[PDB]
Design a protein around this ligand. Structure first.
Ligand SMILES: [Zn+2]
Length: 7
């Protein structure tokens, strides 16, 4: 699966 971190 794909992953996104929005800090
Ligand atoms: Zn993955």
């Amino acid at each position: 699966g794909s992953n996104q971190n929005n800090f």
